[PDB]
Amino acid sequence: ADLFSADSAYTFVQRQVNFGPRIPGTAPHRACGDWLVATLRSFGAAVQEQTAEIKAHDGTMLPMRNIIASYRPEATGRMLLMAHWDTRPVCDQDANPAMHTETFDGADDGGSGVGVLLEIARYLGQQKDLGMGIDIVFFDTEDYGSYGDDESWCLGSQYWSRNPHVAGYKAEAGILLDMVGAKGATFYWEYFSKSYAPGLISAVWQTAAALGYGNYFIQADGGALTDDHVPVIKNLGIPCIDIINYSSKNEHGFGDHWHTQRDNMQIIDKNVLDAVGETVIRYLDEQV
Ligand SMILES: [Mg+2]
Numbered sequence: 001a002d003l004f005s006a007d008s009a010y011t012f013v014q015r016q017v018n019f020g021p022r023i024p025g026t027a028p029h030r031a032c033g034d035w036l037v038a039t040l041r042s043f044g045a046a047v048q049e050q051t052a053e054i055k056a057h058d059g060t061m062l063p064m065r066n067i068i069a070s071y072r073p074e075a076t077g078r079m080l081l082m083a084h085w086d087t088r089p090v091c092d093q094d095a096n097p098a099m100h101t102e103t104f105d106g107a108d109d110g111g112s113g114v115g116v117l118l119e120i121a122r123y124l125g126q127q128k129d130l131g132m133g134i135d136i137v138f139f140d141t142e143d144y145g146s147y148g149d150d151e152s153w154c155l156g157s158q159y160w161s162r163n164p165h166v167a168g169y170k171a172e173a174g175i176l177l178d179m180v181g182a183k184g185a186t187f188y189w190e191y192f193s194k195s196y197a198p199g200l201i202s203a204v205w206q207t208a209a210a211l212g213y214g215n216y217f218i219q220a221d222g223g224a225l226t227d228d229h230v231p232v233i234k235n236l237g238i239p240c241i242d243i244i245n246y247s248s249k250n251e252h253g254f255g256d257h258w259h260t261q262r263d264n265m266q267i268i269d270k271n272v273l274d275a276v277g278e279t280v281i282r283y284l285d286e287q288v
């Protein structure tokens, strides 16, 4: 019995990629967001969209579109799962400087976390009685920033955590998935995750260990990464962790495909998606 379908998650990554790059303000972004909403609703979630016009670092006005999907919306004890769904507009880390003005698929950076969570949604919609409320949030406009400028990233999570869909929203725990699909990925303890949610990072990494995934979930320090979980911690006080492919042994910390033309379907590994999905589902089931 396989609780998390790696084949299905892989297909959700490919679906997103086949729309074209999900660049804020563009037609593939609108079409893919439409499909993400319809698909979450077909898996039994109550889905609402949170929209706003946000100013990006270069002055572009972006039509931000956060996607919020809920199971058992009346329950007071809730678990929060997160991923960003936009694609950075340019592969400005490509090894070929001529590519820094071009677009790329965002298969891992964007596709992988959404794909894993769509498959978890499919699983949740089949349960006959959830033991807690569950929210799945896909943040927009995470990846439109500038490297010297931390506030220029994670615009959708900053907006949502300051203006959530219920007043004073609380979840007991929050898990962010970012770049969880590439062959050879290494999930170390991200610093802010460990500093603010030691119990959660311990429970998740220990669950992965018990499932046989200690070759992916490494019990050692990783990077201090500003990501969508940090605004949630700071503004909502929810202990959140980030599961993210990162190692200080990597040239750019992130995997070698990050913000290059090689972040495309050929670097995606079903076994990495499975390790992450099976760990998350097991942890969720053991909370109830
Ligand atoms: Mg599986």
Ligand SMILES: [Zn+2]
Pocket: 088, 109, 143, 259
């Ligand atoms: Zn990125």
